Symmetry: C3
């Protein structure tokens, strides 16, 4: 019911939706906040979904327009413009659209536009969450509020390892958001395969996920689901190594007063140089791994109409 000036759904996605084919949304923030590994790794993510028997929709703001599904040139535009592209959460969305700017959507904002377009399934690396020190700083991702209110299943590696996972798990419960371990009781640690922390429920198949999605929304329980999909054991980072870098990066952000939306990008960029780019490599792989699972979920859900 929304104006075409505000929101444009691409021909392929529009068609995939027309023909009731499985569609999987993707976020644009990851691919702004590292060229060339930026625009390239995004192109392959889509192909990964295409080879799975599903349809990719990468989501972004371009020229003040909310776009569902992008083109190679658009992807390239976002990858090269880099940090010069505004990072867009819920509170940012109206201003980029109004001012006709380009923007890269976080999980919260990608969920929003996905929902507007009727897409129930969304794949990313990791969700935002409660940051370390949040009991003091109140720094808590808008992603969690979006998850609370907006009906979309986000497939991820868990919360980004840079966050406070224990606080995050409590937060999700409080707000009624299912945290689903895929073939795991233990909450996947992003880079690491497990955590000291447990998911809310373990489900062993995409079909069981899709079936729960259907029940959830048919019962009117609005809000999304977190599917925590652990990283392949071969692409995992060694615990002491990944966590030593993270701990140091976190501590450096404090000394330097990094706050607000810049925190996550700063932390990940630091951790990436502190591991010599090994953390990035793992980040790329979990993305692929999530896009595959996301594709299965999407088709099962399509089956279940």
């Amino acid at each position: 019911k929304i104006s075409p000036e505000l929101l444009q759904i691409s021909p392929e996605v529009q068609d995939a939706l027309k023909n009731k084919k499985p569609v999987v949304a993707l976020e644009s923030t990851i691919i702004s906040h590292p060229f060339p590994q930026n625009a390239q790794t995004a192109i392959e993510v889509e192909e990964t979904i295409r080879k799975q028997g599903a349809v990719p929709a990468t989501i972004a703001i371009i020229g003040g327009v909310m776009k569902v599904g992008l083109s190679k040139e658009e992807i390239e535009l976002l990858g090269r413009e880099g940090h010069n592209v505004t990072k867009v959460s819920r509170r940012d969305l109206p201003f980029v659209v109004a001012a006709g700017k380009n923007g890269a959507t976080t999980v919260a904002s990608t969920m929003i536009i996905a929902a507007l377009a009727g897409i129930k399934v969304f794949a990313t690396g990791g969700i935002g969450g409660v940051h370390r020190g949040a009991e003091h700083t109140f720094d808590i991702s808008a992603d969690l509020q979006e998850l609370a209110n907006t009906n979309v299943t986000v497939v991820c590696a868990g919360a980004k390892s840079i966050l406070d996972l224990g606080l995050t798990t409590e937060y999700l419960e409080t707000f009624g958001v299912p945290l689903i371990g895929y073939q795991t009781k233990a909450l996947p640690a992003f880079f690491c395969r497990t955590s000291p922390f447990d998911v809310s429920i373990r489900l062993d198949s995409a079909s069981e996920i899709a079936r729960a999605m259907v029940v959830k929304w048919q019962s009117g329980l609005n809000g999304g689901l977190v599917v925590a999909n652990p990283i392949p054991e071969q692409f995992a980072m060694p615990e002491h190594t990944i966590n030593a870098a993270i701990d140091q990066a976190v501590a450096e952000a404090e000394a330097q007063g990094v706050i607000g939306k810049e925190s996550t990008p700063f932390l990940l960029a630091r951790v990436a140089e502190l591991t010599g780019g090994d953390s990035l490599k793992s980040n790329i792989q979990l993305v692929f791994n999530n896009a595959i699972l996301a594709s299965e979920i999407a088709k099962e859900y399509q089956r279940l109409a």
Copy 2:
């Protein structure tokens, strides 16, 4: 919505059609809340209390994957017998127990949800979940508070369960715009005790005023529920110093043993019963009857205005 998902018993259906006042009840107090037989038999007696007050009880649970509004004696026994084998079900758990054809005992959050689906506006319980002790560090905060923020049901209780942090819970309710009504009390009752150092948001002396405020609240578009805090009858109340000791010890022990999540409340209540030689349980039972009685009057007074 689908009868595959949600089923209302004939007794409850007849009540809603004929506009007789209905009082919802939770099932988590039947399985995880107390022990057998004290669970099943008490649950049955609660229903009878409501009936004797001239209202219609609807106990809510998930049976074989079905959200049920109103339960047979058989079903109540099942939940009571199965006990801790039954999944404790809050908002986040609900979709999975239904999908997998399982049994579940519903918390305040879950019961509110199902009640609302049924058009039941009044719900009696022992005490609500809340902000936990230490939550400024742990973020352990019941999904009950978020349900009260967003779902239109009046929940009649003895306040929040006193194993929790009452001060933080009263701030939280305020922030989320939930009325905390003292029934014939300004002091917030604290479960087993009549008083606490804390206040409700408003004192009201009659079921009639409460029902009037419900109609006004919801006709003005202010979605969310209401907490009615109802002090335990004097004869069943527990001495402050005695119950507060047992609670402090149970809490300190939960933390030493690394108890967390949904297991916290059941663990704490069970330990308090131990430490009080079963007395806290006896009080928990009496406060539930008391709330069922008040809830019945509120439902009567609400139904009188509503339809």
Copy 3:
């Protein structure tokens, strides 16, 4: 479609809304609670005049004899100003009870947003919003204003959050809940009495036209919630940084020492600060309200041009 028993809009305001004239809502808490008599009613009446001089139509909002009123006479304004703290301070949680019992009440930002939204008014001018209190990471004291800004579609023009609060935590809280914090011609978040602070707004916008356009896009895109427009106090009416801060710090330590909590906090703090500053903080407060009313009117005119 709200019952006329609950909600009454003044003939002028209703005429303006029908004819698509720009309307600015005003709160009543600043009248009864935020400021002393006579300076409170005097201020409130002259605010309405200010809005009129800017080509818009003021609507002061309060609860009068149990009725939510949009637009008030000067007597009603003066009644609220004279009765003072005898008038109930009404947030979201209080609203149903004052309306139900037929009482008078002065609306905070939260309940004013609610009533404005019911009347279809998109722009609301106030002094400063509630927010996260100092020590809230411990106390959980967090204004219901923030939750209302999260879920209700009204642009609130203020001088920031009142600086008696914890501004850093408030900025974090607003982001989590998806609420734009707009600097009018400023990068730094102004703090009430003070033009700047250590904190930044979410976005800087230099014209009322830009704010109006963002509002249309936000709401046409289905992103429910309000917007904070933080408008710095004009430099000549500003408090000296060192002086106002010593006053606030002391008032805050005193409120804590005296065990002042809950809804009495903000009015206690502002009164104490006025005492400590010799009425100077009040003078700044009155001027920033005028200045916000001016900007609010421009925003309303622009929005009306778009919508």
